[PDB]
């Protein structure tokens, strides 16, 4: 990942001929390895990447193997090298014009290959080392949204947008806020025959622009512009006229995109800037005449139906939903996704308990550990003497025995109130025994 300045193992003249030999060659995986090994020295790495972008450029912008094949193979080599080592991405920060030649060579056929390269290429900007960001011709990139895109090519599109938002936020916002406002005009104009299934690619491109805006956040200037989108008339017409008819005819999958694009607008925040070393500060702006909270609480059942089918919505389009709206099942499912995403080593630690004193034999060992230690442990329960069941049954029986013993008459920690229990009076609870409540926790 760091720079490498090695001895030039190959004279620079033959690396051009070597590049064009691997390009006009099938099964070139190990051939790319040699290009990476010779690019260990800075000079050959620079010459190889610029040879690669030059081959891409002259074949499509200017026009044996076909130019379509050689362009697809040129992109295949450029993208492979930027993934391995990534000190090839830093060569794009040295020239910059290399990026503009990749940008110029991006048509309706090339868009798929070109976006995948630029997502990894965007890493040069990361260390705040671009030198001339004003002369990058980024307006070509933001306009790539006109081309048809797969969800995989769109995934790579957001990557370059994330890595360049602190440089082109006002330019990026200008396109996106306009495109979404023009798209929302189009739905409202054809509202008499609007079908979210028929008009799918339209609502997909709309939800794509709205999400892209949320990534960078609004500026104090686009605050007036942001609320115009959050209160577009098509929103009211859809959830009060179209939606009821679409429920009885269309599949839930087709209805979801409008709920996503709608939740995204009211999820968007005003972001100030990168005050921290990497993270950029956020601020929540509020709405007034909008029917957002009204629509979300009216359709709280259909919204939860979408989250049943796809729980990863709470981590993307519906991430800014009020957790109030979530039904217990979805709310609990999301709680488990969020706690488990923080992966930390889980060590199996043995616990020796007696059938009679499951509580004391557990309290004695567990309380020597700390919260972090007890949270990540894979408790291997071993009931003394009695060894006749599986580790999964012992784990359960240990919890089951602890819950029977805590509400114990001899422990006297809790006093019953029918089926439930409450702690015993502070006068009856012993001073040294107060620690037993921390252990129950």
């Amino acid at each position: 990942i760091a720079e490498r300045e090695a001895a030039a193992s190959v004279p620079i003249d033959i690396v051009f001929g070597l590049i064009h030999m691997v390009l006009q060659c099938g099964n070139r995986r190990n051939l790319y390895r040699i290009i990476h090994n010779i690019s260990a020295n800075k000079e050959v790495r620079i010459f190889s990447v610029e040879t690669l972008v030059n081959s891409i450029y002259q074949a499509v912008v200017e026009g044996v193997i076909a130019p379509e094949v050689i362009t697809k193979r040129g992109f295949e080599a450029l993208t492979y090298l930027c993934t391995k080592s990534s000190d090839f991405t830093t060569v794009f920060s040295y020239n910059t014009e290399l990026i503009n030649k990749i940008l110029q060579a991006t048509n309706k056929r090339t868009i798929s290959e070109s976006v995948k390269l630029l997502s990894t290429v965007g890493d040069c900007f990361n260390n705040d080392k671009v030198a001339e960001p004003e002369n990058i011709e980024v307006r070509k990139y933001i306009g790539f949204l006109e081309y048809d895109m797969t969800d995989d090519t769109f995934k790579h599109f957001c990557e370059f947008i994330k890595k360049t938002d602190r440089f082109y936020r006002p330019m990026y916002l200008l396109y996106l806020m306009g495109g979404s406002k023009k798209s929302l005009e189009e739905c409202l104009d054809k509202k008499a025959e609007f079908n979210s299934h028929t008009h799918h690619k339209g609502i997909i491109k709309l939800v794509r622009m709205l999400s892209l805006v949320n990534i960078m956040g609004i500026t104090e200037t686009y605050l007036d512009s942001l609320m115009e989108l959050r209160e577009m008339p098509f929103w009211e017409y859809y959830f009060n006229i179209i939606l009821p008819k679409e429920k009885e005819s269309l599949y839930a999958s087709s209805i979801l995109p409008l709920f996503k694009a709608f939740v995204i607008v009211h999820t968007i925040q005003m972001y100030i800037g990168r005050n921290e070393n990497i993270n950029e500060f956020s601020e929540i702006p509020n709405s007034d005449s909008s029917i957002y909270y009204s629509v979300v609480e009216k359709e709280k059942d259909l919204i939860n139906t979408f989250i049943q089918a796809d729980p990863d919505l709470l981590f993307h389009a519906f991430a800014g939903l009020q957790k109030k709206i979530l039904d217990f099942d979805n709310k609990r499912i999301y709680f488990y996704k969020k706690i488990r995403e923080d992966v930390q080593l889980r060590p199996t630690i043995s616990l020796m308990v007696q059938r009679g004193a499951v509580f004391e034999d557990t309290f004695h060992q567990l309380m020597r550990l700390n919260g972090e230690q007890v949270r990540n442990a894979k408790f291997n329960i071993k009931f003394a003497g009695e060894e006749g069941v599986d580790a999964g049954g012992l784990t359960r029986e240990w919890y089951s025995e602890l819950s029977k013993e805590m509400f114990n008459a001899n422990y006297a920690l809790f006093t019953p109130i029918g089926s439930s229990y409450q702690p015993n009076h502070i006068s009856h609870i012993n001073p040294e025994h107060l620690v037993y409540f921390k252990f129950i926790g």
């Binding site: 001895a7 193992s9 033959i14 030999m21 390895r33 040699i34 090994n37 295949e76 969800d151």
Partner: protein, 1445 residues
Amino acid sequence: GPMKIPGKQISNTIKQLSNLPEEELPTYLNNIYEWRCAKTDLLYWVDVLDRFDEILKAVVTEYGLGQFQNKPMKESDKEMVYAILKFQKLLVENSSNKSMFSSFDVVEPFIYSFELDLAIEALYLVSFFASKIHIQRSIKTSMALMKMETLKTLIERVKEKPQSMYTYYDETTNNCKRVSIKKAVKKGIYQEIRRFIHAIRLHEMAEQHEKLKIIRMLAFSALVYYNYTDLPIDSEFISRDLPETLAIINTESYQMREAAVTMIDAIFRMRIRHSAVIAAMNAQSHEGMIMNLLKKVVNEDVPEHFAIVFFNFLSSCFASGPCVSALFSAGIVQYVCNTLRDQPDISYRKRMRLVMGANTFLFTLPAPFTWFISENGIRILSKELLLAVDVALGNIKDHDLLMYINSIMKIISQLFKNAGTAEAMRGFLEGEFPRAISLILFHSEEFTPSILAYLFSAVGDYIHNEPSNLPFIIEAGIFDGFVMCMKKELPESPDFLLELPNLIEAFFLNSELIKKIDEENILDRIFESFEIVNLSNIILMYDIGRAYGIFLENLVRHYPIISLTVKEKIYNTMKNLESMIPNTDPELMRLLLGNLFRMMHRAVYRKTTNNQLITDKGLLNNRIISMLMLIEIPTETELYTDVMNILMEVFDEDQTYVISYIAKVIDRVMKNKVTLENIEKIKRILLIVNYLIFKNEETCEEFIKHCTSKGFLQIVKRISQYFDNLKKDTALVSVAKNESLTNLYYSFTMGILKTVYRYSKTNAKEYLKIFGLLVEDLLSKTEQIDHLYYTQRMHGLKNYIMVDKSPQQYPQKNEFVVTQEYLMGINLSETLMEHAKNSVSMLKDEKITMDAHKKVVSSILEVLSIYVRGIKNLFVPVKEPKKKVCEIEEHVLIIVELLMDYIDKSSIEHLLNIVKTAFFVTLRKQITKEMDRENEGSAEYKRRNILGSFFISVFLNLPKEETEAVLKSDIFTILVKNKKTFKQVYNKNCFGLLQYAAIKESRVFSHLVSFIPKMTKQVGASTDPAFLKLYAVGLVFVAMRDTLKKTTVLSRFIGNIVFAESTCPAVVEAQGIVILAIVKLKIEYNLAITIEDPIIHLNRIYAIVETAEQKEGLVILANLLIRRVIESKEAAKEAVDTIIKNKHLGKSRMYTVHTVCSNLRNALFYSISSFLEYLSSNFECISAGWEEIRHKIKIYSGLNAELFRTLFVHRATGKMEQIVRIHSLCLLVVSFPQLISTLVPEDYSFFMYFLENHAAYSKSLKPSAFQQEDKTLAYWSGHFIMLIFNHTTYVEVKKYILEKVLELLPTSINATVIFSELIQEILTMRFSKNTFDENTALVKEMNCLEVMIRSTMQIDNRRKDYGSIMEILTKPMEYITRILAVDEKEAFYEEVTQQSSSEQSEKNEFLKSLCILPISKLIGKEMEIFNADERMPFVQKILEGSIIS
């Protein structure tokens, strides 16, 4: 090529295709559209596919195969092959052992034919076959009959008249040009042949273009399954080739979309770029390409080939983890649930296809299973099952309907069997499942046994899960239906048979049900299976026999109430099968028994609880003993293994009952008819008592008292009478059969004698009573009219005497414990003496054959040797008991004296053992050495000396074959110790015998020293290898003796030896051994024997190694002679010092001197003067019986490099000689790397030879018609080069080599491959880090990369071979660029890519065996020729004493 070593509908279709005339075959093959039958085994269709291979071979040998001369293929021929290829695929799809299909070589030519319809059908068989490579792996050999790489020509994308001229690349001229096919004049002229054929069809047939477009899809799919790696899978393939084919699936005609589905299914099953594959089909979508296509098949009446080929792909999607998750979001689980429960218009086959999909999608991901449970999926299946059962009930079986019931039964039995998906058992009692299950059980006859097998796996698993619901299952009539089911016969279905006991054990949970199972005799189905001939193959093929035994064991241990009826049915079945033995074919009978005993093994004699109830030792004994006397069971079989383990367990329980029973049985058969079959009953009953007695460890007293009893011994006597009666009628029992019978009798009696002797608390007279009776009877027999079986009785008596032996705790302790006085009294030595006089008298009267008489001599000498071994201090003087013992000493001399002339290769072994026992005290060293000397003046000592004189005379009048047996015995160290006897044997030219005896004894060697000056003159032109070996050994041993203060002796040896020409390799080797000895001795000692230059004879060894057999001995000798010429005294001492340094670091105990000496015997023998220097000053931690001692860049001096230059510039003409010569240089480069520096820069020109004959064969590109001689010649030549680069640090020598390697590298593609790999091999073989880093910094200075890169760039040409060559050339230029990318420090740690035909096989395997050996092992190979595998020579003995002193 044909195959190399059933049913009713299957037998009929097989017989029909075998009989039918060739004209009527395609009409019948067409009729078989689908396999609506049980899966067959390819073994049954051998003669069917043999005829199919033959008719296909008749078509390709008539039309052309490669040329396809007759362009118009007749309709009768084309429709015949179309019918064969179509049926073959259907047959192998639904058959077992698919890899057996050996007709693939004749299928291939149809792919490249001008008949579009045939090519498609041939590719469909290859495409399906390739799909099973990852599953069986044995099928790759079946597909190796056709070339898979040639299919890559079909891969090319099809366009509307793209290339009207085919471009071709040719060898020798190396040019590529166009060829116009547009002429269309004649079918002939319009490996490159197959590729050109396709190029013709692409442009010439544009009308039937759709048929060739789908040919590329099948060819692609077959190659995806073969090697997904060497395929054109690019990012461009995913961008356009992937979505183009799935568009065809959704739009093009059924013939086209069927083949496109096959191609998609291959990429899918091989998981190649699988993430993007699922993404291309839009699997997540509610109306996706895959989701909508399912409704297309389910609702429309599409062709069955398309419906099957689609449903097969759909089932493979349900197997993919991420695909099934995407299909789940489309609503696949919601579709299958609604389609089955709501839509009843669907066919029984399509309904079953939907259930079949769920049988996979419910087990791949947990998420769809939880959704199935929430959608009440089990209730949907139960409702549908009850409906389907009711329909079939009472009506003629509908195959489709029964298959639907079978799929519902599979899905439920499998859901219940799967632990994780046990949630399916929730709505069981509520649902229609118990109702349909009882209905099936009541009318079992109306359904498949495979349905009834799933029925048990569902009912049983449900009962076992929650046994609290068993009353509800009984209440639903499920147990009553099961009993009704058990009234019907057993089916030939292993699934039914194996699942039956599991349901019985699950029914046994209710105590009321056990009374019904016992009452209704339902357990009879479990036992009767063992006696049904038809089931026997199935019980064997599956582990049904073993499974039933485990079941009986578990059923009896958990519920011992059935123990009575289980024990009753076990021993009843044992008797029923025993009854079949007489009226059954032995091959089948042994199969039935093997299955029964595989059950018996697991059911009886288990250490488990309640098992004692079903195990009756008496019942088991009577049946096992009876069975053994009716059928002959071979030891090799597992039946014998199981039978004898149970018989051993019965014998262990009551040893006495088993023997008294077989004693009553054996004499009962003797009273019966004396027939040949009754003979085998008595033979087999003795062979079983012999196994029981030999395998018995602890023996009880009552068994021993039964053996010594008059009742048992009287029966034994009647056996000897019955057996000797058989010797009267020679027509009935042949002499050979009677000899075998006699040998069985004596083995039987010897066995009972052995157990009585071994048994503790055994009286001396109790053993002597049996010994007495048995020996006295044996001795009376050898005094009858019938002398024909004399050798058989004498062999028996030898083993009788052998029983009385000491327990053998002291090394070689063999004397008579009790029988000494008995045998002395009965005058065994005196009768043996009379036996020798009588037999030799018959030879005077010419009443016995000379060959026959020598066999009698062997018999008398064999018995005598064993008798005299047990006599205490025989030929040892002691005044008190020298009365009768002395008489035996004289008997030995008389016996030997009589039969001295009549000894042979057979008798000489016994004569040696008699002499070995006569000289025992001197031989095994019992004497005090000084006492042994004073003993010499004895009657006993003088008697043994005359026996030695008989033995020497006997040995000297025997030829090379006879003597070889006892050429190196320990008796000669005593016999030849007398100077007079030593000269007697030397004059009789038996130099071998003397060599071995001298190596061991100093006194014997003392006499050999005296001959060395005399025999020095005969060494030149000797022709006797043993004589040359004796001389060379005598010289080196006398040099080592001189090291231990002798010195003056080896100086006195003066002479001149000039060796004569020899065409014999045995003589040439022995001549070389003499040179090797003289040469190496002149290194550290002063030897005055002057010989001709060792190179004169070394060259002879190189020339003779090509023609001679057993070449190893010559290569070792020549290489050791080269080493001993070049190696200095300083280098030889340092080689020995280094060998001892390895056993110094270990700092272990190493207690004795003898251990250090015999372990380092090779080092000892290399230079004993150097070996003694190391131990004396650098003393080790050797105890030696007195506490312990204190302990703690190859630059050699004085090497003779003239031989290295000589051998380096030799150049042999012969193929073999060159390999050995280059191998020799490889050893020198390793042993003394300083020899390279001796080469003058002019001598660098001779290196070219090694590079040239290494480039002759490319190791990577394996060429055709290569010879293994050429391959190892190329290898060792290149190996010599890389050994120079790794074992030396001579920069200018390496710089010259690399210069010539780089000059040769771009001369040809062959040279580019072999040299780029050679330059890589110099680095990949990393001898040292400093040597590797020297070669690493040198190749970058030399610009090696620039040379191989430019070479590969120039050889770039559009040729299908280029892709193969690139995968080869990139490997060395990747490794080399990688080392030069990483710093010098981490460069080393970098790894790569991070009887004439019977004699030809002997010489080729020798070329593989030649290798560089470690110096420790190489020095050992030298010691092997002088020491001759003797663990201790006399030189080692005197050395040990010097070390301690």
